[PDB]
């Protein structure tokens, strides 16, 4: 039936529609939310992912992480629309019942470490983590919790394999900005799929036709909810087409739960993959031996109708979201 | 008066040395131990420093945390040879740690258990909280990614590093710092304040001598002929090794150095410089790299702020006042075993 | 106006073509012949470079010097280097080395790694401005003569097939064989003060593609004139086309080192952007990425690239080829 | 007899103790001088070497090569480069360069890095078993060199001014000079099959000290013969002095390159062990460090999995300071009465 699993991120207007596609699919049981550094800070982000939450009516159930603020051995490095509603009628967070707090400036980066040990401990096999940001917080739990690793599998938004990076050259965001958690997480027997690689996000692209779409499935039931999701899905939409080419954004996020939703739409092809750590320039580079024992699986492209399967599921999620907004 | 402080080590012979030290010095209020990877596995050094605790009558006092067991980005027979600890492991009693955390045995034992005891003392700190450090230091780089606000509430005193003279486990590195050097290039550019108390440059010049063995004897062997023969055995365990494989007559003695530091600073000399850690080198990661020849070339052009404080020699005077310290905690220990 | 010029390069069968198309065309000059390790040892590149001039009737004309045999701080990655065909009478009725008169040597056991830095060296003092280079191998030797003739830097231009920058690397995952072979060349080149262009980077060279059109081109042209021609440039040209196929995804080769001599002929063929390239040296599974700032450019530049031709690029390339196939063909008969 | 050997070297005052040493020493034939940029810039090293070579009437004898003016792939560190004296006179009445010659070139103008190539390799095929270099500055030379004589590599011998083993570094916190300033050529050198020794690392120079003991002893062998050559070996002999007593803490200044040299002439007076180098090259505050397996092979000598490349000098036998400072004390006097 459905796949219990918990969400690392950093919301982000991807991340946030991840976010809604895992909570309201039935397919999936979301446990919780941790959120990383990475767009943001991960303070303001552990605040995004809390604003997702209340726009789709979940923040009093879900409960929300804030975790680690840097990468393990480097520095660091939801705009569109008006969240001051969102955000004075916040409900508490669940996370701090579960934890003994009063309020959220007790809340820890390691919070979320006893809770996830709890869910591993629980799996009849292994439990299923959608990371979408920087890997942190998971290098940081296995650091901490290393005989849990043969019992995590894990479904990312990171890498680019066969086309090259976006933030850098020849890497993508989530990967540069730690290298070395994930390539601690590689090769701490963790179970790793590169789910949505830049190679299948630049090929998920958000068209008027897809906007259509949008509007189809939700005005009829909430025109605020529309105006919303479609300034955030049009917000760094000048960037990708002046800064990178895209006539049309890609939307990278909610592809990495679309594959725990529904993998069978996913090519896979298993592979030893190296994280470039060394590099002064290509640090965050996933180098392949694909065109050493396998370490990942990588998913190189959607099978067809994959791409018409991702949007009917995301715009499912939209209008039942737009459902309970009315 | 007296100085709160926290231990973090991997016993290790040394290490056994200076928590004796730390906690039969008045001087010293030992307020836990945590302990880490390195010599052996984070287990063993978690029991190594349980047994030093049982041996000087202190298991039932003060909590041992069991602290992360590898390096941030790197890989890693008792700990503690020499020596019999069947009588003293059967004979070990409960965990403080236990009650603080909540955990009914050992096995709930994590890394990161010591990270809230440590927040209260360091909130607690007039100043800044006192660290000893006489093992690999990952276990404050994960607190300090933790708790990066704290970093300036913290000082830390560490046996780590070679200076003026080479390395030890390799040709320009010491094994603390090697082991996981990423850990102290973090905590160094954390704005914790930071000595560099013991390295290789003094702890070399500290040597367990016939000389040193024999007030050990004359301390111990009036009050307690079994603890004698036990110190003594675990001081010469690994002196074949300094002879041969180092060239010590005498084997050194490291980690008490340390908390001699902290117990009496004016023995030590001081300098303040940057200090770099080598970790992209691939024969020399753990290099501890200063600018203090830089500094009397031209301190004019020096770019970059001071970050650490490092002890390169005792004063005079300063030997005779470690051993007299060291040799009194163990006369007091020998006392109290009976 | 035709253009001095100098080819230094591992042929290797593009390198084969890229000469073909130097010496025959009449826009350039070739003075000489460097060639260096890649492919093959630089032994047996320059011997593939001898072997293309006697082909072509050019080896008693063109001196051909033997260059540096490693990168300058790395160990050698990598038949003859020119297989697919019999070089058994080329190889017997192969005529003296020019070069051999030049430097007074008596045989080319004689020859050494630095015999060309005089000759380039007369050959830059003479250019009114700077002196033209292509480089479709390592860039060792130039990298070398620069640590030789530091103040000739900036009297030297370059213009290479190498790197890829807007897609991924073929040898490794995003860097190209050229540059990944000695890439501390690359970068000493880079930061020398030479006027360097990645002409053809494989963003190009992917897209110039031997189809079966192409051949029939070619044999359109040469079989009439010269049919033994015809066998050995067809054999040569689909030599790595099963592994370009398979390994590679490729249903028709890329034809990568002639597309940097068409640079030095017809420039007006490609687009051009400038840029600061870092080569990437540290890296352990990146050496020789090149890595731009191209998409930071919102807000000091050290080479041009060439990203991409114009339209008719494509086809003005192969017509140049062709035509000079066309005229080997009937110069051998 | 006697050994052929060339000398590359960038003087330096050490570099001109040395120089002195090898020509004047009948135990050593130098064939040539090359230069390599370290100290100076090579254009102000080779002239250093031409003046060292006038003042102690061998200009027109020994043909002085201008060598790499850069490392392999790192910028340079790079006064006259031989101060504390006045160099006019030796400057105005320098003889022909005999490399010219050699050359075919008209005027210094024409020297070029590679010319010294073709005369080594004369030397290596001529060489019985190998042929001797003495190196004691920068080894750029020699990399170059190797990387276009390769085969040559198994036929050369390599003494060299370089290093610090189980003492700490020079001018950077754990490497010394000659080795930190282009560590890709020793690295290059050190796997090309030359026979290489580290003749006098930091380990035994920073014990070869100049004291009044051993000024007064120069004093003694030179003033007799030539007082004008005695005020300048000792300006150049104490012109870094002051440094090394504040910047290093040397009451006394160490003689480094000469011990190299001294190695050639007489390698009884020197401790040696086989050991493996590794030069570090890709550590950012550490390149230039010599990492050997010395201490592996005490603790483990049967997981070594990596051959000997180097022997290591690490201290002299007993007598060794001594016979040094007799033999470079016995070349000074030598030069005292040829210089009159
Ligand atoms: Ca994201
Ligand atoms: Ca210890
Ligand atoms: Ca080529
Ligand atoms: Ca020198």
């Not at 916040?90 to 959220?104: C, F, H, S, V």
Request: with cysteine; aromatic share 10%; hydrophobic share 40%.
């Amino acid at each position: 039936m459905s796949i219990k699993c918990a969400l690392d991120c950093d919301p982000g207007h991807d991340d946030l529609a991840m976010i809604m596609l895992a909570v309201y699919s039935p397919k999936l049981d979301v446990q919780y939310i941790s959120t990383t550094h990475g767009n943001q800070t991960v303070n303001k982000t552990y605040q995004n992912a809390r604003r997702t939450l209340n726009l789709i009516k979940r923040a009093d159930k879900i409960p929300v992480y804030r975790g680690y603020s840097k990468p393990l051995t480097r520095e660091s490095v939801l705009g569109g629309v008006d969240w001051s509603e969102i955000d004075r009628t916040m409900p508490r967070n669940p996370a701090l019942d579960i934890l003994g707090y009063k309020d959220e400036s007790e809340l820890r980066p390691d919070d979320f470490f006893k809770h996830l040990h709890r869910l591993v401990s629980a799996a009849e096999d292994k439990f299923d983590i959608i990371s979408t940001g920087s890997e942190t917080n998971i290098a940081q739990y296995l650091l901490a919790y290393p005989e849990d690793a043969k019992k995590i599998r894990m479904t990312t938004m990171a890498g680019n394999f066969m086309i090259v990076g976006n933030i850098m050259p020849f890497a993508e965001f989530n990967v540069l900005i730690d290298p070395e958690a994930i390539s601690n997480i590689l090769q701490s027997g963790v179970d790793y799929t590169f789910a949505a690689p830049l190679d299948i996000t630049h090929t998920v692209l958000v068209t008027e036709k897809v906007i259509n779409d949008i509007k189809a499935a939700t005005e009829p039931y909430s025109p605020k909810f529309t105006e919303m999701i479609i300034k955030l899905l049009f917000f760094f939409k000048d960037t990708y087409r002046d800064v990178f080419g895209f006539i049309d954004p890609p939307l990278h996020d909610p592809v990495a739960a679309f594959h725990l939703i529904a993998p069978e739409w996913f090519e896979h092809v298993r592979c030893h993959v190296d994280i470039e750590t060394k590099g002064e320039y290509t640090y965050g580079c996933c180098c392949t031996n694909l065109i050493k024992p396998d370490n990942a699986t990588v998913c190189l492209k959607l099978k067809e109708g994959g791409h018409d399967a991702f949007w009917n599921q995301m715009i499912t999620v939209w209008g039942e979201i737009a459902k309970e907004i009315g």
